[PDB]
Point group: C2
Chain length 194, copies 2
């Protein structure tokens, strides 16, 4: 019933553009929206986010997360490991690659979502969420070496899956960090499944 009529470029940077979207509302009235898009999409989606489940015998299972300075936020954020999918890369391959670059861990694919939207009232950005298990007892994950690209500076924070929400809330209270909404949503549902 609703659809896009036209998209006007307002401003195009190197990485991001701002458009004015004209669309038909369901009453038959024409309306406008200010929309953000990335300039980098080619792909199934802009990026991947990895849910990395660190499995070590006789330990609690952990979810592996990353802490980095985020210039749009003006501060440090706790997130799932994540990055843009390279042209001609599969989401699964982007997931293992980003996980290794950002954390040093080598994981196995468990499942892969369809393309899911990041903030659909604002942008067209999408990701695949890729669940990955990490056999923490294997020798390649003994001393994981993060291989960060240029300008990436990532700290690794592993938190137990069974208390994830309480651990994140503690980090916020004590560290003045911002937790990512996807991370927080995941943590909430671990608690709510009960």
């Amino acid at each position: 019933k609703q659809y896009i009529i036209s998209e006007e470029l307002i401003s195009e940077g190197k990485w991001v553009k701002l458009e004015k979207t004209t669309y038909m509302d369901p009453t038959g009235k024409t309306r406008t929206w200010e929309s953000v898009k990335r300039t980098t999409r080619k792909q199934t989606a802009d990026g991947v986010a990895v849910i990395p489940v660190l499995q070590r015998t006789l330990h609690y299972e952990c979810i592996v997360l990353v802490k980095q300075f985020r210039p749009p936020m003006g501060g440090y954020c706790i997130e799932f490991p994540a990055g843009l999918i390279d042209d001609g890369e599969t989401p699964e391959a982007a997931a293992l690659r980003e996980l290794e670059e950002e954390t040093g861990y080598k994981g196995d694919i468990a499942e892969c979502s369809p393309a899911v939207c990041m903030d659909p009232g604002l942008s067209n950005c999408t990701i695949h969420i890729v669940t990955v298990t990490i056999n923490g007892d294997d020798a390649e994950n003994a001393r994981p070496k993060p291989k960060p690209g240029d300008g990436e500076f990532v700290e690794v924070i592993s938190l137990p899956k069974n208390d994830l929400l309480q651990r994140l809330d503690a980090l916020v209270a004590e560290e003045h960090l911002t937790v990512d909404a996807r991370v927080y949503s995941y943590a909430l549902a671990l608690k709510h499944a009960n």
Copy 2:
């Protein structure tokens, strides 16, 4: 270690702006980023709220109440938690209950309220509170709920059982050409992983 040096306006619309952000990297080198922000944020602790609405009825399985709407940035329909921006002077909790009633017709009870969490921190400064709300679906006020959408708001309600959320979302994606929100999908995935 890292911090913002300057934020230069590139382009400002009615609702969204783009900025050139200069920051200090942990090596001591100046770098730039292209940053998106909303123009609507005042003294709110976040831009918006998203509501996790747990519909509870005797002799029924718990349902998660979701909304489907056309999203001009996406050029299509999206399935999301009920959500909206926080009005000036409004608490996150009040915003939540208000947006839930407006979008779904249901009158909820606050359960929990998250700290401000980031929507897409590599791109934007946008933040929300995630507000968990229970809905007593045996209460007569919640018998035949009618959405009171605002001007230019056109929302469908979709209530799915919590105990099968991920499969039910996958079945909707399989039938109809729509995008699930990343927070919804992350919450559904944790329900499975628990």
